[PDB]
């Protein structure tokens, strides 16, 4: 049975509005929900974060490709709404009073995509899980205790002879090489902002469902559904009760979410091609002849003829018109399985669609991201993450008792003590809070509280920008004043 | 693009794979017929004598890695109870 | 008798969609509208504009502070159309299929106020203001002629014996020192990018209606309507057309203008007051004591002592619950002057509602604006804009058929031929296009065509960003290579 | 804000009533009773001996100085008939 | 590339032609057939009547300034012995 | 403020107790009644029980961390003849 107001709750984790409530008052909620989003200094940071270029130019940063991420996903939601109310089966599913929260949905859902990734992208994630891997070595802990443990903590090493602190250890170890940028976008919008959203706009940006500590073999009725982490260990709990909010067995995915992927997937070709133009690279000429030698007769000839700032409006156009009906009837054909949350596929993924997008890719890997400045870039952000781990080094050599003194007020640590009076204040405040709340005579203590200090040290480096983090990395090495 | 954690399994399994005194050959293309990416694995000796030989297709690269890094694994086991 | 269905008019100016169309089709209509606005290259100008403070920490741009007036203006129609329905009153005023395109045409004439200031903002048309001003000397040609013109072109000089010659003068020098940014923004939105929007969008963004050349006193009956400039002499026949198009008398206003108004007096105070926190000038305790001082029990004592990141999204949720009632209210109210257009008064302008937006703004000039940074920024804003103005200066001494074949292609121009070269290829191809439809006999060419020159060197200058212009003003000066 | 050539006529206005040999005194306030602003303009001559004086009230700034100036010219052609 | 100097000479003696009340016409362009560069001058009033034409014809650009600078001259010579 | 060798001895004595075998519990405060700075070390042992605790009290912190590393090299050489 389809009865979307099971999915779309309205209530929150803390004061929480109780009791009945008509289509104004909801409406009211998610329009306050879209107010807390948008005003949010996560946004004003993705105002300030590289995409492909270097921020100079009219270049594009994070905000405005989600900000075109918004706009096709809530064209797709108009869209698969109208099919919806033509068949007459909007009130048949539960849609009559809440397609308003169904776009807001989905719009802020497209608009909080980036807001967790690291600074340079995906060449800060490959930095830090380098880095804690070197440090860490999970591949030891797969079986029963070795001799040769390459572990760098005591804390942290298998020895024989106990089997119920061994579990927790192998969980530790694995989850702390796997930093993904969603798992750390849930993290950031529950416990570091703390935005209090609703249940629906929590589901909405969980993208995967693989848990960050999982080894092995995935079932092959969730291959990919799991192809990525989905989030920490430090938020478990708080999964399974929005879990029990949402109706949603173990592994399982809500169904907007899919609606929010499509988005990411058009854009991102079409966006960054103009952006080369712009920076004087090639020519319009020389986009034509590209893309008829990797090679689509509607759409190219259209565009190619048509023309002989204004060209790239007329391309986009009949690409959406080609895709977004697409995307709507998938669906909707589809919509049982998407509601119970087991489709194993995505919506666009053998149709003249993925030749149209896998055209454009792959221009755009050949002419485009080839560019040496891309590669230096890339390059120099790997090294300022490691150089920044390396400098923060010494925040994790400490003991239990050094670093629980150093929180709580030294004079035995100076440059410790200035180290960690560097950081933020939200992400100790984060540390002192999830600290608080562990029985303080288990045996389990010590794994805890270094699991919670390398978290606190990846919310640090991860919320930085790039200029932000470049500046301070030649600032704490003593190479500029 | 591909995920690093993903690779670095991937990577991981080849190592423990080479210290086993085994050699592993990697090749990949693009069926544009079938419309996905193919990669074949052959498994070899210090003699350069095939023994194990599979391909894979997905249109996805994050799966077809996990495919790829589960197939090592089971050989692994396979072929590690001894030589 | 009000009809919205007269008022809300989806043709375009050419390619015009023509005959009968249903609701999806029109939403569609307005869809593409909001595609072409949000992937314009003014949107991505706006995203490295300064506000108020000097662009770097996670301090606004306009394009966040866009982003806000969108909200509030997107609130505050769902707000009037909420009410409307409540009182059975949606479809006698013709809104009953209309819902859609009036909330998308309001955020998108929220997110256009800002698309063309000049650089550095109210220092920048200050700067041209009195470049042009001291150039032309427009006050000497109130009357019949002089001996004593201090004006320095030939051509504009007004020589007694000729009085049908002379009006154009007054005319053209009396607007050429009037540059506004809302006039320039329907300049750019229509002729200098060519988006062919439709006709309630464009006058959407027609925000006063004085015209630039006016001499004199404007009637008693619309003192408020004719404050400040509203369109170009350039622009006079479109906006003809643009008045047949919605049913406008002269100097009338589109209906919607007055929420966007709205939505641009709030968030002009608060905002402002939080980034004063962020960059470390001052302190939450000393925010409560200024404003006590300054001066409410309900806001000021709720946020003061629930308090005892996470204040200012409390404090601005009460003053939005407070304000977007009482402008629906005040719309809804008035309703037929405003469809009339004939409204000589604000929304928001003696209720509590102007009491705290004083309050908020007079802490703003006390403790935010008098910082010697913004100070600073201002003088050099001014002087920069001088200067480029001054080095552009040899292109405006030229003559006709100088510069005539100048266009055309010279050996006898380097210095001049190098600095038209430097101007871009859109305002050139618009001075083209301007100067091609005028009669090549008349005694008026010359003055059409300084007009147009002036107008070409005035968009050059405006179409920058405070950065691009400050490195263009020292490569210019030798300064820097 | 106050708009820039609103000033700049205003500016014009009182050069032009200097130059006819007279004197401008300008005063402004905030009347909170009103809930308005308040600028009065007093007009002398060389001796230094009031003429005319009016004080206008208003909300906003800009219609504050439109009147102001209307009020200046209309001054001026009445005594600029002669004197 | 043409020097200076001619440039200079050539806008002086336009500038003495003007500030005769004539006015001075200029064309140019390039002659493929003779492979040359060919420039025509038009004299004219404050009217607009023409006076006198010429065109000249050369490979190097800064014999013909020197020729059109000196025709230039020769016939303010010719008319400025009045009107 | 506290000179850096004087910490430096205290962290080799602290380091030679804790290679020994020992734990070392470092609190320490100031008293505004008898206008000094108080610091008190308990020793223990991998267990967490007590064996030596004292307290030392003065107005200056160089002589205080002296009297520290006297009583634990005291300590050590005490308790080091063996266990």
């Known amino acids: 049975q389809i009865d979307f107001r099971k999915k779309i709750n309205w209530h929150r984790r803390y004061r929480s509005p109780q009791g009945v409530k008509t289509e104004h008052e909801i409406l009211r909620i998610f329009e306050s929900d879209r107010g807390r989003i948008i005003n949010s200094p996560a946004i004003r940071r993705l105002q300030q974060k590289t995409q492909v270029f270097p921020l100079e130019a009219a270049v594009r940063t994070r905000l405005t490709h989600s900000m075109e991420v918004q706009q096709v996903g809530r064209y797709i939601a108009k869209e698969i709404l109208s099919r919806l109310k033509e068949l007459k089966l909007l009130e048949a599913y539960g849609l009559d009073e809440l397609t308003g929260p169904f776009e807001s949905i989905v719009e802020m859902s497209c608009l909080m995509h980036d807001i967790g990734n690291p600074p340079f992208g995906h060449f800060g994630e490959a930095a830090i899980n380098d880095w804690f891997r070197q440090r860490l070595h999970p591949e030891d802990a797969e079986s029963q205790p070795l001799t040769d443990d390459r572990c760098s903590v005591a804390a942290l090493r298998l020895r024989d002879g106990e089997e119920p602190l061994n579990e927790l250890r192998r969980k530790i170890r694995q989850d702390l090489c796997h930093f993904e940028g969603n798992a750390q976008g849930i993290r950031l919008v529950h416990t570091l902002m703390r935005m209090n959203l609703t249940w629906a706009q929590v589901g909405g940006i969980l993208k995967y469902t693989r848990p960050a500590w999982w080894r092995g073999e995935t079932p092959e009725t969730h291959h990919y559904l799991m192809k990525k982490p989905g989030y920490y260990l430090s938020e478990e709990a708080y999964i399974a009760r929005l879990r029990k909010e949402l109706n949603l067995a173990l592994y399982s995915r809500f169904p907007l979410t899919w609606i929010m992927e499509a988005a990411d997937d058009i854009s991102y070709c079409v966006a960054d091609l103009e952006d080369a133009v712009e920076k004087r690279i090639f020519t319009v000429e020389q986009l034509y002849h590209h893309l008829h030698e990797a090679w689509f007769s509607l759409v190219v000839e259209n565009a190619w003829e048509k023309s002989r700032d204004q060209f790239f409006m007329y391309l986009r156009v009949n690409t959406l018109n080609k895709l977004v009906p697409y995307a709507a009837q998938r669906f909707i054909d589809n919509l049982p399985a998407i509601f119970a949350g087991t489709f194993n596929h995505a919506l666009l993924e053998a149709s003249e669609c993925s030749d149209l997008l896998k055209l454009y890719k792959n221009v755009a890997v050949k002419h485009v991201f080839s560019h040496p400045d891309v590669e230096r870039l890339e390059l120099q952000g790997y090294r300022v993450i490691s150089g920044l781990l390396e400098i923060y080094r010494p925040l994790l050599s400490l003991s239990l008792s050094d670093f629980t003194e150093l929180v709580e007020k030294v004079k035995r640590f100076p440059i410790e003590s200035r180290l960690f009076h560097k950081l933020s204040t939200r992400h100790r405040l984060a540390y002192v809070e999830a600290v608080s709340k562990l029985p303080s005579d288990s045996p389990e203590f010590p794994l805890w509280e270094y699991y919670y200090r390398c978290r606190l040290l990846q919310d640090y480096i991860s919320g930085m920008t790039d200029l932000y983090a470049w500046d301070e990395y030649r600032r704490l090495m003593a190479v500029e004043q | ?83």
């Open chain 2, 1 to 83: 693009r591909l995920y690093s954690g993903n690779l670095a399994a991937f990577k991981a399994a080849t190592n423990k794979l080479f210290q086993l005194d085994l050699a592993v050959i990697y090749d990949d293309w693009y069926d544009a017929y079938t419309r996905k990416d193919c990669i074949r694995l052959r498994i070899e000796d210090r003699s350069g004598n095939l023994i194990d030989t599979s391909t894979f297709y997905h249109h996805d690269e994050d799966v077809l890695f996990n495919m790829c890094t589960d197939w090592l694994n089971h050989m692994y086991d396979q072929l590690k109870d001894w030589k």
